Amino acid sequence: GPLGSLNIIQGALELRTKTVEDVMTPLRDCFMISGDAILDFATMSEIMESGYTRIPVYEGERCHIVDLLFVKDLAFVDPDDCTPLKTITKFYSHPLHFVFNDTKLDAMLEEFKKGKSHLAIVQRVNNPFYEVLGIVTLEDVIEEIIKS
Amino acid sequence: GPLGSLNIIQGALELRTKTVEDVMTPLRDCFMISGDAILDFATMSEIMESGYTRIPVYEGERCHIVDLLFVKDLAFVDPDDCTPLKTITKFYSHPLHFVFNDTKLDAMLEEFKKGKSHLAIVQRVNNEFYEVLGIVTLEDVIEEIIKS
């Protein structure tokens, strides 16, 4: 009981020192879908079976994330139509947020609390190109607070 | 910034005094589905559009919650088949957790951390039978911690 609330307090202190790179999901392990996808029955089945609700969309390379698909966006998609996925990502255009790996978790929580979004992409400056490393969710940050 | 870390500490103290009744969702405002439901195209669409991933299932009265439907269970459900919902709830049998309204938030967070489930039903001892008032999610508890 109180020992658990103590760990919460310790996590609220760790937030000012931990970066989003520490708690993110690496790109090699992120469940994503290609923009070339056709929303037939088989494709939508993997989206739902994955358990995720916010799935990054990439074009060509897995590091080129261009859109964000929500599971609620498939509410009016009939698999018999073979609707291309790019059509639905254009229609809803859910905001896609990018952040640097050096971002601290307290600033990350402040950015997540202000907006409805719960997902952000971790990218690092390569040395003159942008290098995407992974994604970090709001649920990823809150784990650090309550973890013992 | 640092002021936000204060609210976590204040919430980390307040949770030991707040009951699940204060932060729950009342049954009159809970998105639920009847066990008689047929998983045709129209029904599956309403589940997805709601944005929820864990939807309580009731039999007869809305206060008689008997099962819990996840969105991922529809991965292999063809709307043309008209598969009854009870078939899927029997197949997976996701655990349904009930708690008393007098339960404090510190004890509630401990129960959610131990199990994979993120949903619980708030019931109160009626004196004049079991009186169900609403449901409380893990998202309700962590909000009180981080709330300013």
PDB file of C-alpha atoms in Angstrom:
ATOM      1  CA  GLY A   1       0.000   0.000   0.000  1.00  0.00           C
ATOM      2  CA  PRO A   2       2.107   2.909   1.254  1.00  0.00           C
ATOM      3  CA  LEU A   3       5.222   1.236  -0.157  1.00  0.00           C
ATOM      4  CA  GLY A   4       3.559   1.340  -3.575  1.00  0.00           C
ATOM      5  CA  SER A   5       2.706   5.024  -3.178  1.00  0.00           C
ATOM      6  CA  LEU A   6       6.348   5.574  -2.210  1.00  0.00           C
ATOM      7  CA  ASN A   7       7.513   4.044  -5.494  1.00  0.00           C
ATOM      8  CA  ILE A   8       5.103   6.359  -7.323  1.00  0.00           C
ATOM      9  CA  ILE A   9       6.785   9.324  -5.617  1.00  0.00           C
ATOM     10  CA  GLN A  10      10.226   8.041  -6.630  1.00  0.00           C
ATOM     11  CA  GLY A  11       9.041   7.739 -10.229  1.00  0.00           C
ATOM     12  CA  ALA A  12       7.795  11.335 -10.180  1.00  0.00           C
ATOM     13  CA  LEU A  13      11.404  12.281  -9.374  1.00  0.00           C
ATOM     14  CA  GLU A  14      12.967  10.054 -12.051  1.00  0.00           C
ATOM     15  CA  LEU A  15      10.875  11.805 -14.714  1.00  0.00           C
ATOM     16  CA  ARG A  16      13.125  14.886 -14.828  1.00  0.00           C
ATOM     17  CA  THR A  17      16.173  12.694 -15.592  1.00  0.00           C
ATOM     18  CA  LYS A  18      14.908   9.952 -17.938  1.00  0.00           C
ATOM     19  CA  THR A  19      14.797  10.394 -21.707  1.00  0.00           C
ATOM     20  CA  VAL A  20      12.111   9.043 -24.018  1.00  0.00           C
ATOM     21  CA  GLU A  21      14.732   6.828 -25.685  1.00  0.00           C
ATOM     22  CA  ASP A  22      15.027   4.770 -22.491  1.00  0.00           C
ATOM     23  CA  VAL A  23      11.363   3.695 -22.403  1.00  0.00           C
ATOM     24  CA  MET A  24      10.502   3.769 -26.117  1.00  0.00           C
ATOM     25  CA  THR A  25       9.787   0.770 -28.325  1.00  0.00           C
ATOM     26  CA  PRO A  26      12.613   0.226 -30.846  1.00  0.00           C
ATOM     27  CA  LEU A  27      11.674   0.471 -34.511  1.00  0.00           C
ATOM     28  CA  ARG A  28      12.752  -3.140 -35.090  1.00  0.00           C
ATOM     29  CA  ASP A  29       9.956  -4.232 -32.716  1.00  0.00           C
ATOM     30  CA  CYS A  30       7.187  -1.765 -33.662  1.00  0.00           C
ATOM     31  CA  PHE A  31       4.001  -3.160 -35.208  1.00  0.00           C
ATOM     32  CA  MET A  32       3.420  -1.042 -38.324  1.00  0.00           C
ATOM     33  CA  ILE A  33       1.618  -1.316 -41.664  1.00  0.00           C
ATOM     34  CA  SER A  34       2.714  -0.255 -45.142  1.00  0.00           C
ATOM     35  CA  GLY A  35       0.855   2.559 -46.882  1.00  0.00           C
ATOM     36  CA  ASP A  36       0.508   0.187 -49.855  1.00  0.00           C
ATOM     37  CA  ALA A  37      -1.897  -1.919 -47.779  1.00  0.00           C
ATOM     38  CA  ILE A  38      -5.311  -2.925 -49.124  1.00  0.00           C
ATOM     39  CA  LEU A  39      -8.018  -3.082 -46.447  1.00  0.00           C
ATOM     40  CA  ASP A  40      -9.319  -6.527 -47.302  1.00  0.00           C
ATOM     41  CA  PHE A  41     -10.440  -9.008 -44.647  1.00  0.00           C
ATOM     42  CA  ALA A  42      -6.963 -10.462 -44.109  1.00  0.00           C
ATOM     43  CA  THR A  43      -5.287  -7.080 -43.574  1.00  0.00           C
ATOM     44  CA  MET A  44      -7.882  -5.701 -41.145  1.00  0.00           C
ATOM     45  CA  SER A  45      -7.729  -9.008 -39.256  1.00  0.00           C
ATOM     46  CA  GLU A  46      -4.043  -8.532 -38.407  1.00  0.00           C
ATOM     47  CA  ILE A  47      -4.756  -4.943 -37.331  1.00  0.00           C
ATOM     48  CA  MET A  48      -7.402  -6.078 -34.848  1.00  0.00           C
ATOM     49  CA  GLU A  49      -5.638  -9.259 -33.700  1.00  0.00           C
ATOM     50  CA  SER A  50      -2.515  -7.224 -32.866  1.00  0.00           C
ATOM     51  CA  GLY A  51      -4.367  -5.639 -29.933  1.00  0.00           C
ATOM     52  CA  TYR A  52      -3.046  -2.180 -30.815  1.00  0.00           C
ATOM     53  CA  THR A  53      -5.341   0.783 -31.423  1.00  0.00           C
ATOM     54  CA  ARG A  54      -2.794   3.246 -32.880  1.00  0.00           C
ATOM     55  CA  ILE A  55      -0.628   1.725 -35.613  1.00  0.00           C
ATOM     56  CA  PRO A  56       2.094   3.681 -37.461  1.00  0.00           C
ATOM     57  CA  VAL A  57       1.980   3.761 -41.258  1.00  0.00           C
ATOM     58  CA  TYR A  58       5.229   3.701 -43.242  1.00  0.00           C
ATOM     59  CA  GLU A  59       6.021   4.323 -46.913  1.00  0.00           C
ATOM     60  CA  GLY A  60       8.807   2.279 -48.478  1.00  0.00           C
ATOM     61  CA  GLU A  61      11.217   2.055 -45.547  1.00  0.00           C
ATOM     62  CA  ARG A  62      10.056   1.146 -42.051  1.00  0.00           C
ATOM     63  CA  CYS A  63      11.791   4.306 -40.789  1.00  0.00           C
ATOM     64  CA  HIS A  64       9.635   6.535 -43.038  1.00  0.00           C
ATOM     65  CA  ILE A  65       6.518   6.839 -40.889  1.00  0.00           C
ATOM     66  CA  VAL A  66       4.004   9.077 -42.655  1.00  0.00           C
ATOM     67  CA  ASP A  67       0.614   8.540 -40.963  1.00  0.00           C
ATOM     68  CA  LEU A  68      -1.184   7.052 -37.963  1.00  0.00           C
ATOM     69  CA  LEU A  69      -4.079   4.604 -38.303  1.00  0.00           C
ATOM     70  CA  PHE A  70      -6.628   4.231 -35.510  1.00  0.00           C
ATOM     71  CA  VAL A  71      -8.683   1.076 -35.072  1.00  0.00           C
ATOM     72  CA  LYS A  72     -11.847   3.208 -34.979  1.00  0.00           C
ATOM     73  CA  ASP A  73     -11.085   4.368 -38.537  1.00  0.00           C
ATOM     74  CA  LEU A  74     -12.141   0.935 -39.861  1.00  0.00           C
ATOM     75  CA  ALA A  75     -15.712   1.421 -38.600  1.00  0.00           C
ATOM     76  CA  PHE A  76     -17.039   2.040 -42.131  1.00  0.00           C
ATOM     77  CA  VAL A  77     -14.525   0.011 -44.179  1.00  0.00           C
ATOM     78  CA  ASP A  78     -16.069  -2.962 -45.994  1.00  0.00           C
ATOM     79  CA  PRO A  79     -13.400  -5.611 -46.773  1.00  0.00           C
ATOM     80  CA  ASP A  80     -15.196  -6.524 -50.010  1.00  0.00           C
ATOM     81  CA  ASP A  81     -14.399  -3.048 -51.390  1.00  0.00           C
ATOM     82  CA  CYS A  82     -10.592  -3.473 -51.228  1.00  0.00           C
ATOM     83  CA  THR A  83     -10.249   0.127 -50.058  1.00  0.00           C
ATOM     84  CA  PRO A  84      -6.568   1.169 -50.150  1.00  0.00           C
ATOM     85  CA  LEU A  85      -5.219   2.233 -46.774  1.00  0.00           C
ATOM     86  CA  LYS A  86      -3.905   5.580 -48.070  1.00  0.00           C
ATOM     87  CA  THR A  87      -7.518   6.629 -48.698  1.00  0.00           C
ATOM     88  CA  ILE A  88      -8.437   6.284 -45.012  1.00  0.00           C
ATOM     89  CA  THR A  89      -5.257   7.915 -43.692  1.00  0.00           C
ATOM     90  CA  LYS A  90      -5.934  10.920 -45.931  1.00  0.00           C
ATOM     91  CA  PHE A  91      -9.579  11.053 -44.822  1.00  0.00           C
ATOM     92  CA  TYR A  92      -9.023  11.214 -41.064  1.00  0.00           C
ATOM     93  CA  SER A  93      -5.466  12.634 -40.962  1.00  0.00           C
ATOM     94  CA  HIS A  94      -4.803  11.934 -37.310  1.00  0.00           C
ATOM     95  CA  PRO A  95      -1.987  14.222 -36.102  1.00  0.00           C
ATOM     96  CA  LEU A  96       1.480  12.662 -36.120  1.00  0.00           C
ATOM     97  CA  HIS A  97       3.858  13.963 -33.447  1.00  0.00           C
ATOM     98  CA  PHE A  98       7.651  13.694 -33.677  1.00  0.00           C
ATOM     99  CA  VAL A  99      10.090  14.239 -30.796  1.00  0.00           C
ATOM    100  CA  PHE A 100      13.825  14.006 -30.182  1.00  0.00           C
ATOM    101  CA  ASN A 101      15.321  11.221 -28.083  1.00  0.00           C
ATOM    102  CA  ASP A 102      16.832  13.740 -25.649  1.00  0.00           C
ATOM    103  CA  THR A 103      13.333  14.787 -24.530  1.00  0.00           C
ATOM    104  CA  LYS A 104      12.827  14.233 -20.811  1.00  0.00           C
ATOM    105  CA  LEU A 105       9.769  12.358 -19.569  1.00  0.00           C
ATOM    106  CA  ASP A 106       8.379  15.292 -17.564  1.00  0.00           C
ATOM    107  CA  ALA A 107       8.309  17.350 -20.759  1.00  0.00           C
ATOM    108  CA  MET A 108       6.908  14.300 -22.562  1.00  0.00           C
ATOM    109  CA  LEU A 109       4.060  13.963 -20.057  1.00  0.00           C
ATOM    110  CA  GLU A 110       3.326  17.688 -20.379  1.00  0.00           C
ATOM    111  CA  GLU A 111       3.080  17.380 -24.168  1.00  0.00           C
ATOM    112  CA  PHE A 112       0.836  14.312 -23.897  1.00  0.00           C
ATOM    113  CA  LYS A 113      -1.406  15.901 -21.255  1.00  0.00           C
ATOM    114  CA  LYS A 114      -2.045  18.973 -23.421  1.00  0.00           C
ATOM    115  CA  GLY A 115      -3.134  17.030 -26.505  1.00  0.00           C
ATOM    116  CA  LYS A 116      -5.526  14.159 -27.190  1.00  0.00           C
ATOM    117  CA  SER A 117      -2.683  12.110 -28.706  1.00  0.00           C
ATOM    118  CA  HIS A 118      -1.047   9.276 -26.764  1.00  0.00           C
ATOM    119  CA  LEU A 119       1.752   8.411 -29.224  1.00  0.00           C
ATOM    120  CA  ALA A 120       4.957  10.119 -30.352  1.00  0.00           C
ATOM    121  CA  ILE A 121       7.881   9.121 -32.574  1.00  0.00           C
ATOM    122  CA  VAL A 122      11.468   9.225 -31.298  1.00  0.00           C
ATOM    123  CA  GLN A 123      13.936  10.542 -33.879  1.00  0.00           C
ATOM    124  CA  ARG A 124      17.611  11.456 -33.569  1.00  0.00           C
ATOM    125  CA  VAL A 125      19.714  13.875 -35.611  1.00  0.00           C
ATOM    126  CA  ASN A 126      22.178  11.847 -37.684  1.00  0.00           C
ATOM    127  CA  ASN A 127      25.640  13.244 -38.408  1.00  0.00           C
ATOM    128  CA  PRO A 128      22.438  15.877 -42.199  1.00  0.00           C
ATOM    129  CA  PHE A 129      19.438  13.524 -42.173  1.00  0.00           C
ATOM    130  CA  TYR A 130      16.694  12.623 -39.708  1.00  0.00           C
ATOM    131  CA  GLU A 131      17.046   9.188 -38.098  1.00  0.00           C
ATOM    132  CA  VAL A 132      13.878   7.640 -36.662  1.00  0.00           C
ATOM    133  CA  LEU A 133      14.552   5.243 -33.782  1.00  0.00           C
ATOM    134  CA  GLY A 134      11.149   4.204 -32.449  1.00  0.00           C
ATOM    135  CA  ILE A 135       7.863   5.260 -30.902  1.00  0.00           C
ATOM    136  CA  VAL A 136       6.974   6.094 -27.303  1.00  0.00           C
ATOM    137  CA  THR A 137       3.429   5.998 -25.925  1.00  0.00           C
ATOM    138  CA  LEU A 138       1.777   7.680 -22.962  1.00  0.00           C
ATOM    139  CA  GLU A 139       1.344   4.207 -21.462  1.00  0.00           C
ATOM    140  CA  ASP A 140       5.116   3.781 -21.780  1.00  0.00           C
ATOM    141  CA  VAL A 141       5.724   6.866 -19.621  1.00  0.00           C
ATOM    142  CA  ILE A 142       3.172   6.009 -16.917  1.00  0.00           C
ATOM    143  CA  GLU A 143       4.843   2.615 -16.455  1.00  0.00           C
ATOM    144  CA  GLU A 144       7.955   4.367 -15.115  1.00  0.00           C
ATOM    145  CA  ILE A 145       5.860   6.138 -12.458  1.00  0.00           C
ATOM    146  CA  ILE A 146       4.200   3.035 -10.992  1.00  0.00           C
ATOM    147  CA  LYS A 147       7.084   0.602 -11.558  1.00  0.00           C
ATOM    148  CA  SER A 148       8.759  -0.643  -8.380  1.00  0.00           C
TER     149      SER A 148
ATOM    150  CA  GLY B   1       7.179  21.645 -15.231  1.00  0.00           C
ATOM    151  CA  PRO B   2       8.231  21.021 -11.628  1.00  0.00           C
ATOM    152  CA  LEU B   3       4.759  22.108 -10.489  1.00  0.00           C
ATOM    153  CA  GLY B   4       3.385  19.147 -12.439  1.00  0.00           C
ATOM    154  CA  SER B   5       5.582  16.770 -10.449  1.00  0.00           C
ATOM    155  CA  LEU B   6       3.983  18.229  -7.307  1.00  0.00           C
ATOM    156  CA  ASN B   7       0.490  17.188  -8.407  1.00  0.00           C
ATOM    157  CA  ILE B   8       1.689  13.595  -8.814  1.00  0.00           C
ATOM    158  CA  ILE B   9       2.887  13.648  -5.197  1.00  0.00           C
ATOM    159  CA  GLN B  10      -0.381  15.227  -4.050  1.00  0.00           C
ATOM    160  CA  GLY B  11      -2.276  12.546  -5.959  1.00  0.00           C
ATOM    161  CA  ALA B  12       0.052   9.873  -4.573  1.00  0.00           C
ATOM    162  CA  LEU B  13      -1.135  11.023  -1.136  1.00  0.00           C
ATOM    163  CA  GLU B  14      -4.807  11.609  -1.992  1.00  0.00           C
ATOM    164  CA  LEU B  15      -5.333   8.139  -3.490  1.00  0.00           C
ATOM    165  CA  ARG B  16      -5.123   6.475  -0.058  1.00  0.00           C
ATOM    166  CA  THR B  17      -8.156   8.582   0.948  1.00  0.00           C
ATOM    167  CA  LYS B  18     -10.240   8.485  -2.252  1.00  0.00           C
ATOM    168  CA  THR B  19     -12.644   5.649  -3.020  1.00  0.00           C
ATOM    169  CA  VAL B  20     -13.365   4.132  -6.420  1.00  0.00           C
ATOM    170  CA  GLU B  21     -16.844   5.686  -6.200  1.00  0.00           C
ATOM    171  CA  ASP B  22     -15.371   9.164  -6.717  1.00  0.00           C
ATOM    172  CA  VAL B  23     -13.546   8.414  -9.989  1.00  0.00           C
ATOM    173  CA  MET B  24     -15.750   5.697 -11.496  1.00  0.00           C
ATOM    174  CA  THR B  25     -17.958   6.036 -14.553  1.00  0.00           C
ATOM    175  CA  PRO B  26     -21.650   5.766 -13.591  1.00  0.00           C
ATOM    176  CA  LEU B  27     -23.583   2.901 -15.142  1.00  0.00           C
ATOM    177  CA  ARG B  28     -25.880   5.404 -16.873  1.00  0.00           C
ATOM    178  CA  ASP B  29     -22.860   6.633 -18.882  1.00  0.00           C
ATOM    179  CA  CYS B  30     -21.068   3.324 -19.581  1.00  0.00           C
ATOM    180  CA  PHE B  31     -20.874   2.105 -23.185  1.00  0.00           C
ATOM    181  CA  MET B  32     -22.131  -1.491 -23.058  1.00  0.00           C
ATOM    182  CA  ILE B  33     -23.552  -4.111 -25.428  1.00  0.00           C
ATOM    183  CA  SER B  34     -26.307  -6.670 -24.871  1.00  0.00           C
ATOM    184  CA  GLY B  35     -25.404 -10.358 -24.810  1.00  0.00           C
ATOM    185  CA  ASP B  36     -28.174 -10.947 -27.375  1.00  0.00           C
ATOM    186  CA  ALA B  37     -26.142  -8.994 -29.941  1.00  0.00           C
ATOM    187  CA  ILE B  38     -25.434 -10.455 -33.383  1.00  0.00           C
ATOM    188  CA  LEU B  39     -21.991  -9.609 -34.784  1.00  0.00           C
ATOM    189  CA  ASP B  40     -23.131  -8.368 -38.175  1.00  0.00           C
ATOM    190  CA  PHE B  41     -21.487  -5.444 -39.972  1.00  0.00           C
ATOM    191  CA  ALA B  42     -23.588  -2.762 -38.261  1.00  0.00           C
ATOM    192  CA  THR B  43     -22.963  -4.056 -34.729  1.00  0.00           C
ATOM    193  CA  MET B  44     -19.204  -4.529 -35.132  1.00  0.00           C
ATOM    194  CA  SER B  45     -19.029  -0.975 -36.509  1.00  0.00           C
ATOM    195  CA  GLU B  46     -20.564   0.578 -33.379  1.00  0.00           C
ATOM    196  CA  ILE B  47     -18.035  -1.236 -31.170  1.00  0.00           C
ATOM    197  CA  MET B  48     -15.124   0.192 -33.164  1.00  0.00           C
ATOM    198  CA  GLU B  49     -16.485   3.735 -33.528  1.00  0.00           C
ATOM    199  CA  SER B  50     -16.859   4.049 -29.744  1.00  0.00           C
ATOM    200  CA  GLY B  51     -13.069   4.149 -29.388  1.00  0.00           C
ATOM    201  CA  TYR B  52     -13.242   1.722 -26.461  1.00  0.00           C
ATOM    202  CA  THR B  53     -11.322  -1.554 -26.436  1.00  0.00           C
ATOM    203  CA  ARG B  54     -12.985  -3.246 -23.432  1.00  0.00           C
ATOM    204  CA  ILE B  55     -16.786  -3.181 -23.564  1.00  0.00           C
ATOM    205  CA  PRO B  56     -18.958  -4.652 -20.778  1.00  0.00           C
ATOM    206  CA  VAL B  57     -21.610  -7.190 -21.759  1.00  0.00           C
ATOM    207  CA  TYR B  58     -24.934  -7.243 -19.907  1.00  0.00           C
ATOM    208  CA  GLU B  59     -27.848  -9.690 -19.883  1.00  0.00           C
ATOM    209  CA  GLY B  60     -31.352  -8.261 -19.589  1.00  0.00           C
ATOM    210  CA  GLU B  61     -30.703  -5.326 -17.266  1.00  0.00           C
ATOM    211  CA  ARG B  62     -27.765  -2.991 -17.831  1.00  0.00           C
ATOM    212  CA  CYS B  63     -26.693  -3.631 -14.218  1.00  0.00           C
ATOM    213  CA  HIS B  64     -26.299  -7.396 -14.856  1.00  0.00           C
ATOM    214  CA  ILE B  65     -22.820  -7.404 -16.389  1.00  0.00           C
ATOM    215  CA  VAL B  66     -21.856 -10.969 -17.292  1.00  0.00           C
ATOM    216  CA  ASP B  67     -18.896 -10.778 -19.710  1.00  0.00           C
ATOM    217  CA  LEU B  68     -16.226  -8.525 -21.207  1.00  0.00           C
ATOM    218  CA  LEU B  69     -15.697  -8.124 -24.958  1.00  0.00           C
ATOM    219  CA  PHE B  70     -12.352  -6.992 -26.364  1.00  0.00           C
ATOM    220  CA  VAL B  71     -12.031  -5.470 -29.825  1.00  0.00           C
ATOM    221  CA  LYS B  72      -9.280  -7.956 -30.747  1.00  0.00           C
ATOM    222  CA  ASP B  73     -11.716 -10.893 -30.521  1.00  0.00           C
ATOM    223  CA  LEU B  74     -13.349  -9.793 -33.801  1.00  0.00           C
ATOM    224  CA  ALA B  75     -10.191 -10.601 -35.801  1.00  0.00           C
ATOM    225  CA  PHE B  76     -11.746 -13.774 -37.265  1.00  0.00           C
ATOM    226  CA  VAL B  77     -15.426 -12.756 -37.210  1.00  0.00           C
ATOM    227  CA  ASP B  78     -16.934 -12.367 -40.680  1.00  0.00           C
ATOM    228  CA  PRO B  79     -20.011 -10.084 -40.531  1.00  0.00           C
ATOM    229  CA  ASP B  80     -21.627 -12.161 -43.290  1.00  0.00           C
ATOM    230  CA  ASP B  81     -21.658 -15.144 -40.907  1.00  0.00           C
ATOM    231  CA  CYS B  82     -23.910 -13.405 -38.329  1.00  0.00           C
ATOM    232  CA  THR B  83     -21.969 -14.985 -35.463  1.00  0.00           C
ATOM    233  CA  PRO B  84     -23.807 -14.436 -32.146  1.00  0.00           C
ATOM    234  CA  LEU B  85     -21.847 -12.468 -29.562  1.00  0.00           C
ATOM    235  CA  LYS B  86     -22.305 -15.124 -26.853  1.00  0.00           C
ATOM    236  CA  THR B  87     -20.240 -17.481 -29.023  1.00  0.00           C
ATOM    237  CA  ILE B  88     -17.211 -15.174 -28.829  1.00  0.00           C
ATOM    238  CA  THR B  89     -17.628 -14.411 -25.119  1.00  0.00           C
ATOM    239  CA  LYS B  90     -17.779 -18.152 -24.414  1.00  0.00           C
ATOM    240  CA  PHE B  91     -14.749 -18.795 -26.634  1.00  0.00           C
ATOM    241  CA  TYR B  92     -12.344 -16.346 -24.985  1.00  0.00           C
ATOM    242  CA  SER B  93     -13.939 -15.913 -21.521  1.00  0.00           C
ATOM    243  CA  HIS B  94     -12.043 -12.791 -20.521  1.00  0.00           C
ATOM    244  CA  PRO B  95     -12.025 -12.471 -16.708  1.00  0.00           C
ATOM    245  CA  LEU B  96     -14.581 -10.086 -15.208  1.00  0.00           C
ATOM    246  CA  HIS B  97     -13.484  -8.406 -11.970  1.00  0.00           C
ATOM    247  CA  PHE B  98     -15.884  -6.937  -9.398  1.00  0.00           C
ATOM    248  CA  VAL B  99     -14.937  -4.624  -6.516  1.00  0.00           C
ATOM    249  CA  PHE B 100     -16.678  -2.786  -3.689  1.00  0.00           C
ATOM    250  CA  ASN B 101     -17.257   0.963  -3.809  1.00  0.00           C
ATOM    251  CA  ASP B 102     -15.490   1.522  -0.471  1.00  0.00           C
ATOM    252  CA  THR B 103     -12.223   0.270  -2.003  1.00  0.00           C
ATOM    253  CA  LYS B 104      -9.485   2.892  -1.813  1.00  0.00           C
ATOM    254  CA  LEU B 105      -7.561   3.926  -4.915  1.00  0.00           C
ATOM    255  CA  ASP B 106      -4.232   2.690  -3.525  1.00  0.00           C
ATOM    256  CA  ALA B 107      -5.638  -0.835  -3.218  1.00  0.00           C
ATOM    257  CA  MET B 108      -7.295  -0.526  -6.641  1.00  0.00           C
ATOM    258  CA  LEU B 109      -4.020   0.320  -8.401  1.00  0.00           C
ATOM    259  CA  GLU B 110      -2.335  -2.691  -6.784  1.00  0.00           C
ATOM    260  CA  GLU B 111      -5.000  -5.042  -8.160  1.00  0.00           C
ATOM    261  CA  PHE B 112      -4.670  -3.644 -11.690  1.00  0.00           C
ATOM    262  CA  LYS B 113      -0.864  -3.851 -11.653  1.00  0.00           C
ATOM    263  CA  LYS B 114      -0.930  -7.542 -10.695  1.00  0.00           C
ATOM    264  CA  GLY B 115      -3.262  -8.624 -13.498  1.00  0.00           C
ATOM    265  CA  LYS B 116      -3.465  -8.004 -17.238  1.00  0.00           C
ATOM    266  CA  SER B 117      -6.988  -6.592 -16.851  1.00  0.00           C
ATOM    267  CA  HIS B 118      -7.596  -2.833 -16.867  1.00  0.00           C
ATOM    268  CA  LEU B 119     -11.335  -2.837 -16.033  1.00  0.00           C
ATOM    269  CA  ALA B 120     -13.361  -3.387 -12.861  1.00  0.00           C
ATOM    270  CA  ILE B 121     -17.021  -3.050 -11.858  1.00  0.00           C
ATOM    271  CA  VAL B 122     -18.081  -1.000  -8.827  1.00  0.00           C
ATOM    272  CA  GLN B 123     -20.766  -2.636  -6.681  1.00  0.00           C
ATOM    273  CA  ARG B 124     -22.189  -1.572  -3.320  1.00  0.00           C
ATOM    274  CA  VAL B 125     -23.842  -3.581  -0.557  1.00  0.00           C
ATOM    275  CA  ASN B 126     -27.553  -2.760  -0.670  1.00  0.00           C
ATOM    276  CA  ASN B 127     -29.584  -2.812   2.544  1.00  0.00           C
ATOM    277  CA  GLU B 128     -33.345  -2.353   2.846  1.00  0.00           C
ATOM    278  CA  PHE B 129     -28.818  -7.663  -2.659  1.00  0.00           C
ATOM    279  CA  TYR B 130     -25.766  -6.524  -4.625  1.00  0.00           C
ATOM    280  CA  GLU B 131     -26.071  -3.027  -6.111  1.00  0.00           C
ATOM    281  CA  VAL B 132     -23.901  -2.278  -9.150  1.00  0.00           C
ATOM    282  CA  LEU B 133     -23.276   1.437  -9.703  1.00  0.00           C
ATOM    283  CA  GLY B 134     -20.711   1.633 -12.500  1.00  0.00           C
ATOM    284  CA  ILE B 135     -17.294   0.632 -13.787  1.00  0.00           C
ATOM    285  CA  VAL B 136     -13.827   2.043 -13.119  1.00  0.00           C
ATOM    286  CA  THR B 137     -10.859   1.639 -15.461  1.00  0.00           C
ATOM    287  CA  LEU B 138      -7.126   1.805 -14.858  1.00  0.00           C
ATOM    288  CA  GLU B 139      -7.194   5.028 -16.894  1.00  0.00           C
ATOM    289  CA  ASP B 140      -9.472   6.577 -14.252  1.00  0.00           C
ATOM    290  CA  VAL B 141      -6.997   5.840 -11.452  1.00  0.00           C
ATOM    291  CA  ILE B 142      -3.825   7.125 -13.112  1.00  0.00           C
ATOM    292  CA  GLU B 143      -5.677  10.295 -14.148  1.00  0.00           C
ATOM    293  CA  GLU B 144      -6.207  11.259 -10.498  1.00  0.00           C
ATOM    294  CA  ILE B 145      -2.462  10.875  -9.879  1.00  0.00           C
ATOM    295  CA  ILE B 146      -1.378  13.099 -12.785  1.00  0.00           C
ATOM    296  CA  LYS B 147      -4.344  15.491 -12.602  1.00  0.00           C
ATOM    297  CA  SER B 148      -3.447  19.091 -11.779  1.00  0.00           C
TER     298      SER B 148
END
